[PDB]
Amino acid sequence: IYQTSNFRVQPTESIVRFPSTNLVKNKCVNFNFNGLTGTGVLTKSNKKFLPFQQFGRDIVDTTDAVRDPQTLEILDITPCSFGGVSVITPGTNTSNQVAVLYQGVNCTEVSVAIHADQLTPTWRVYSTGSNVFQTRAGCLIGAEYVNNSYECDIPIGAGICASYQTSQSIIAYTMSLGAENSVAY
Amino acid sequence: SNNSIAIPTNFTISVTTEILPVSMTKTSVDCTMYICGDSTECSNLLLQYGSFCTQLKRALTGIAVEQDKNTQEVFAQVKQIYKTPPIKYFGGFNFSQILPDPSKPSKRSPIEDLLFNKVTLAQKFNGLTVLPPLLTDEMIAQYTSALLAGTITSGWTFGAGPALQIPFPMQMAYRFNGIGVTQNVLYENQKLIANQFNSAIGKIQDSLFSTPSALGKLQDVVNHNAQALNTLVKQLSSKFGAISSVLNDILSRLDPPEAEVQIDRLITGRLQSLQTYVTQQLIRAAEIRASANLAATKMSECVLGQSKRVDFCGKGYHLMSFPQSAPHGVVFLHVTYVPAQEKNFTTAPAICHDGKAHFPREGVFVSNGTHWFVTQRNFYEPQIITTDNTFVSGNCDVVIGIVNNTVYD
Amino acid sequence: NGLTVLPPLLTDEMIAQYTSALLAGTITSGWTFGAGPALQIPFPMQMAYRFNGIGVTQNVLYENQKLIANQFNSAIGKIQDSLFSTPSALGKLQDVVNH
Amino acid sequence: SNNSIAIPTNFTISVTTEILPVSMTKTSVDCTMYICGDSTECSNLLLQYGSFCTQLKRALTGIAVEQDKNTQEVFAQVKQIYKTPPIKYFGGFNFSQIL
Amino acid sequence: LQTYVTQQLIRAAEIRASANLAATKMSECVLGQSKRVDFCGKGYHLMSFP
Numbered sequence: 115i116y117q118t119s120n121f122r123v124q125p126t127e128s129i130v131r132f133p134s135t136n137l138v139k140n141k142c143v144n145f146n147f148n149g150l151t152g153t154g155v156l157t158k159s160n161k162k163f164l165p166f167q168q169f170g171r172d173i174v175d176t177t178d179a180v181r182d183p184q185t186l187e188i189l190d191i192t193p194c195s196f197g198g199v200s201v202i203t204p205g206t207n208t209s210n211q212v213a214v215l216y217q218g219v220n221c222t223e224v225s226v227a228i229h230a231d232q233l234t235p236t237w238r239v240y241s242t243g244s245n246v247f248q249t250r251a252g253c254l255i256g257a258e259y260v261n262n263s264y265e266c267d268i269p270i271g272a273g274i275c276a277s278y279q280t281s282q283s284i285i286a287y288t289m290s291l292g293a294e295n296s297v298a299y
Numbered sequence: 300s301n302n303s304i305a306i307p308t309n310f311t312i313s314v315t316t317e318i319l320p321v322s323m324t325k326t327s328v329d330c331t332m333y334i335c336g337d338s339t340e341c342s343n344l345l346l347q348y349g350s351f352c353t354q355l356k357r358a359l360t361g362i363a364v365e366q367d368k369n370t371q372e373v374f375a376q377v378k379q380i381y382k383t384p385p386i387k388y389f390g391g392f393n394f395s396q397i398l399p400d401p402s403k404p405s406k407r408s409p410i411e412d413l414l415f416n417k418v419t420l421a422q423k424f425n426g427l428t429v430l431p432p433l434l435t436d437e438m439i440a441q442y443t444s445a446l447l448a449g450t451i452t453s454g455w456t457f458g459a460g461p462a463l464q465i466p467f468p469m470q471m472a473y474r475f476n477g478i479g480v481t482q483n484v485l486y487e488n489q490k491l492i493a494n495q496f497n498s499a500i501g502k503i504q505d506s507l508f509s510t511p512s513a514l515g516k517l518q519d520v521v522n523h524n525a526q527a528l529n530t531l532v533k534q535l536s537s538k539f540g541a542i543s544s545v546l547n548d549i550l551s552r553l554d555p556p557e558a559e560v561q562i563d564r565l566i567t568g569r570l571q572s573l574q575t576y577v578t579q580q581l582i583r584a585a586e587i588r589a590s591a592n593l594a595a596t597k598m599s600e601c602v603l604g605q606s607k608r609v610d611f612c613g614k615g616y617h618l619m620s621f622p623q624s625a626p627h628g629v630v631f632l633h634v635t636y637v638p639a640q641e642k643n644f645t646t647a648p649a650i651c652h653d654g655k656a657h658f659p660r661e662g663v664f665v666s667n668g669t670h671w672f673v674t675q676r677n678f679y680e681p682q683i684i685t686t687d688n689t690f691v692s693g694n695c696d697v698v699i700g701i702v703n704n705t706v707y708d
Numbered sequence: 709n710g711l712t713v714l715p716p717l718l719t720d721e722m723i724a725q726y727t728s729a730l731l732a733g734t735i736t737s738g739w740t741f742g743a744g745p746a747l748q749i750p751f752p753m754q755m756a757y758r759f760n761g762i763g764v765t766q767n768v769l770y771e772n773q774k775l776i777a778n779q780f781n782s783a784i785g786k787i788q789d790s791l792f793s794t795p796s797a798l799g800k801l802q803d804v805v806n807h
Numbered sequence: 808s809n810n811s812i813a814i815p816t817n818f819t820i821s822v823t824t825e826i827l828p829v830s831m832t833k834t835s836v837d838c839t840m841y842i843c844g845d846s847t848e849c850s851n852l853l854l855q856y857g858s859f860c861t862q863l864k865r866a867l868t869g870i871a872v873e874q875d876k877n878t879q880e881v882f883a884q885v886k887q888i889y890k891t892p893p894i895k896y897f898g899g900f901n902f903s904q905i906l
Numbered sequence: 907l908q909t910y911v912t913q914q915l916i917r918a919a920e921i922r923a924s925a926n927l928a929a930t931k932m933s934e935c936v937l938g939q940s941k942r943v944d945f946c947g948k949g950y951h952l953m954s955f956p
């Protein structure tokens with residue numbers, strides 16, 4: 115397994131809310147709240163702001179909340195998804211088909227970015243195929259999840275391995291610790 | 300004194316603990332996202348430094364691989380996944396606090412639950428990610444349970460080949476035979492000893508959660524990793540001698556030829572920060588690897604067999620050990636043997652009989668004031684002197700300190 | 709220029725006291741003071757036990773006690789010379805002071 | 808040969824020495840004095856370089872703390888300060904050079 | 907300053923390894939009799955003094 119590059123989810127449009135378009139939620143979108151620049155996902159929050167406070171601040175230095183200039187609303191700010199990209203492959207002496215693992219993302223967001231907007235992922239022509247399985251380590255594309263147990267061949271994530279089955283294909287499963295046994299005390 | 304000796308008349312069973320870190324957090328860094336972000340000019344300027352980042356990526360990848368290798372080496376010692384019989388009777392020994400609990404979905408022993416609920420903790424930065432470990436918590440708990448089941452129902456036989464069954468009291472007698480105490484001591488004190496053992500185990504619980512500084516070693520790793528990550532994140536808001544800490548203001552506040560130097564200063568500062576972080580991580584990884592090697596050795600020697608090294612598997616004469624899983628580490632429960640209730644005695648090196656010196660086979664000559672007896676070293680149990688338990692091998696006019704008495708044939 | 713040296717927590721006399729305690733314990737008790745309470749035993753008897761621990765019977769010591777001790781004494785004397793004559797023996801501790 | 812053996816008929820007592828480093832020097836450094844000295848302009852320029860010096864001080868303090876733990880682990884092996892008897896007769900053995 | 911600190915850290919790690927070895931030797935060769943070959947001297951071990 116090798117790590118090659120990184121992927122980013124591009125913004126769709128821009129939002130201006132001077133107290134001048136509408137506002138969009140649950141989308142990686144640019145925004146500008148009276149000089150407050152930056153882009154990200156805006157979702158409603160439950161942080162009871164002070165009557166004279168409008169900004170937000172995380173533990174160290176980054177904004178994580180903002181108040182709507184028009185109506186009294188509290189909503190969060192989240193950076194758009196990013197992460198590394200890994201390629202799973204056997205030797206070229208064996209086959210030429212591969213598998214891709216998007217690290218630390220939910221499969222639904224990747225699927226929407228790929229097959230709905232067709233322009234958000236950084237590597238578009240690079241991105242092909244449709245076989246989706248979701249793991250705790252990220253979204254795995256190009257491998258069929260069997261429900262058997264084998265000795266680990268190519269480690270992937272939290273107890274998930276992959277191998278070249280046998281027609282010939284690439285499978286993903288849960289590794290087997292060992293043979294079951296019980297001595298009769 | 301040079302004709303006096305002390306011999307214990309009672310013993311004690313004591314249980315201690317030991318905590319060792321095993322692994323640490325795995326992280327990966329993206330240079331362009333961290334240093335530049337979404338600026339083309341910054342990337343073009345950074346391209347002039349060559350290959351300062353492939354080295355960092357390789358070092359971080361090596362650390363990440365070594366972290367998984369450490370846990371694989373420490374815990375994956377056996378291949379068969381042994382199981383314990385449904386009927387939990389072992390001649391009075393109660394293993395409830397260490398065997399897995401069926402009721403809990405986590406399938407963990409109560410002590411493991413205490414450790415997990417005690418340690419606790421301390422997501423997306425600017426180009427900084429954390430990778431999950433290869434082995435989950437349930438798999439580690441399964442390995443620990445398999446080791447416990449192997450060491451309860453088989454003794455040390457499963458560490459050198461096929462597992463061979465044996466009743467538990469006979470295994471304990473074998474283990475007493477390994478420290479210089481005869482078998483009959485256990486069989487005549489089987490009911491008492493077990494009780495002592497049970498009591499010790501209970502105290503262990505009250506000695507873990509009540510004291511807050513017991514599990515400090517495992518908390519230090521998490522605290523240090525979080526501190527390093529927070530420092531690296533917070534370093535991004537420093538001017539480093541330039542006019543601003545934001546690339547956008549520098550770009551859209553001055554002509555490009557002047558902005559080149561301002562961007563270059565920030566590039567140099569952030570490169571220095573990354574290098575410092577990577578070097579510190581490398582040193583800490585080396586230390587953690589040394590600790591993991593020590594933990595693996597202790598697992599191999601104290602758990603899979605009986606050790607004769609002094610103070611290696613606990614204070615006192617070693618008997619056995621039990622492993623428990625902890626976040627980023629392991630915990631050992633050493634069971635030892637301690638003498639008590641000594642007593643004055645008078646001893647002689649040899650016994651003269653018909654002009655012949657007599658030496659004991661396995662024991663020490665001891666006198667209570669009137670009669671002479673031969674007894675084993677580590678437990679007071681006098682015996683009548685006989686030619687069965689002595690060898691002559693000498694004469695009466697050589698040894699210094701000989702005492703002449705009678706030896707019935 | 710702001711570069712200070714801190715003193716160690718334990719002075720040399722305390723370390724000497726620890727060493728003296730260890731020596732007294734290993735002379736007057738043997739290995740019994742490291743696993744519990746200390747128990748008395750005459751020195752020739754524990755020497756016989758230590759010979760028995762390497763596959764040699766007891767009577768070898770008791771019939772050579774005068775000779776063996778002599779040898780031991782002589783060896784100790786030579787320790788006073790080899791360290792004193794050769795000055796490169798303590799090169800391990802000097803480097804720490806030097807570097 | 809397949810029917811020949813050799814067995815010693817006498818022995819020898821030998822004493823060797825071994826030297827091991829344990830600890831080293833504990834130091835501490837002040838950034839402002841070393842880098843700048845007593846000029847306010849240099850300090851005002853230095854405070855723009857982030858928190859390098861906090862990390863340096865923390866590392867030095869960690870080393871200094873570890874240096875004492877090394878000695879405590881090595882030497883504090885016992886709980887009682889055992890004392891040797893006034894009369895030093897141990898069957899002919901002479902410990903005057905080490906007591 | 908950074909170079910000095912890094913070199914000091916490396917030397918501290920080496921000294922810690924040496925101290926651990928010394929502690930093990932104190933535990934095994936002084937408080938008991940060892941059977942490990944060539945660990946507490948060349949020959950069959952009898953005793954040691956610090």
Ligand SMILES: *[C@@H]1O[C@H](CO)[C@@H](O[C@@H]2O[C@H](CO)[C@@H](O)[C@H](O)[C@H]2NC(C)=O)[C@H](O)[C@H]1NC(C)=O
Pocket residue numbers: 308309310491494495
């Ligand atoms: C060795 O020590 C044990 C532990 O104290 C002694 O066992 C106790 O004996 C008394 C006397 O009958 C009982 O009242 C206690 O209940 C016992 N303790 C336990 C935990 O059961 C034992 O008697 C001692 N051995 C000798 C020979 O005195």
Ligand SMILES: *[C@@H]1O[C@H](CO)[C@@H](O[C@@H]2O[C@H](CO)[C@@H](O)[C@H](O)[C@H]2NC(C)=O)[C@H](O)[C@H]1NC(C)=O
Pocket residue numbers: 393394395396
């Ligand atoms: C073994 O120890 C367990 C405790 O871990 C005993 O189970 C009972 O546990 C409850 C609460 O956990 C206590 O209030 C009881 O006092 C425990 N019972 C006894 C007899 O002490 C269990 O009974 C013990 N014995 C066996 C054979 O499992």
Ligand SMILES: *[C@@H]1O[C@H](CO)[C@@H](O[C@@H]2O[C@H](CO)[C@@H](O)[C@H](O)[C@H]2NC(C)=O)[C@H](O)[C@H]1NC(C)=O
Pocket residue numbers: 775778779817818
């Ligand atoms: C075993 O070796 C010892 C050491 O050499 C022998 O003792 C020496 O014997 C010679 C010859 O009689 C004397 O000149 C020396 O003075 C002795 N040395 C000491 C320290 O007393 C001993 O004789 C040897 N054993 C046998 C059986 O020959």
Ligand SMILES: *[C@@H]1O[C@H](CO)[C@@H](O[C@@H]2O[C@H](CO)[C@@H](O)[C@H](O)[C@H]2NC(C)=O)[C@H](O)[C@H]1NC(C)=O
Pocket residue numbers: 901902903
């Ligand atoms: C133990 O060894 C020491 C060291 O040799 C002996 O002290 C010597 O004794 C002789 C005779 O009295 C003197 O001539 C030396 O000057 C002493 N040496 C030193 C360094 O003081 C000591 O006598 C020996 N113990 C016994 C009991 O004989």
Ligand SMILES: *[C@@H]1O[C@H](CO)[C@@H](O)[C@H](O)[C@H]1NC(C)=O
Pocket residue numbers: 220221222
């Ligand atoms: C992905 O998003 C869906 C949306 O409902 C959610 O149900 C699912 O739990 C998410 N997966 C992860 C791993 O968070």
Ligand SMILES: *[C@@H]1O[C@H](CO)[C@@H](O)[C@H](O)[C@H]1NC(C)=O
Pocket residue numbers: 259260261
């Ligand atoms: C695999 O696991 C069991 C096997 O019988 C089955 O219940 C489950 O639905 C299977 N999952 C698949 C085929 O995706």
Ligand SMILES: *[C@@H]1O[C@H](CO)[C@@H](O)[C@H](O)[C@H]1NC(C)=O
Pocket residue numbers: 300301894896
């Ligand atoms: C040891 O034995 C000798 C015999 O020569 C005697 O003088 C001495 O008092 C004894 N030791 C003690 C402590 O009594």
Ligand SMILES: *[C@@H]1O[C@H](CO)[C@@H](O)[C@H](O)[C@H]1NC(C)=O
Pocket residue numbers: 641642643
């Ligand atoms: C053994 O003898 C010593 C010497 O007087 C004495 O102090 C000690 O109390 C005695 N031990 C017992 C158990 O009486």
Ligand SMILES: *[C@@H]1O[C@H](CO)[C@@H](O)[C@H](O)[C@H]1NC(C)=O
Pocket residue numbers: 667668669670
């Ligand atoms: C000493 O042992 C003898 C064994 O024959 C016994 O008769 C005697 O009573 C014992 N002495 C004491 C004080 O118990």
Ligand SMILES: *[C@@H]1O[C@H](CO)[C@@H](O)[C@H](O)[C@H]1NC(C)=O
Pocket residue numbers: 703
């Ligand atoms: C037996 O021991 C006594 C006391 O030491 C001694 O007087 C006697 O001579 C010894 N017996 C023989 C035959 O030497």
Ligand SMILES: *[C@@H]1O[C@H](CO)[C@@H](O)[C@H](O)[C@H]1NC(C)=O
Pocket residue numbers: 808809
């Ligand atoms: C082994 O023994 C045989 C006869 O017992 C003898 O001929 C042969 O030489 C011996 N081997 C060696 C290597 O001496």
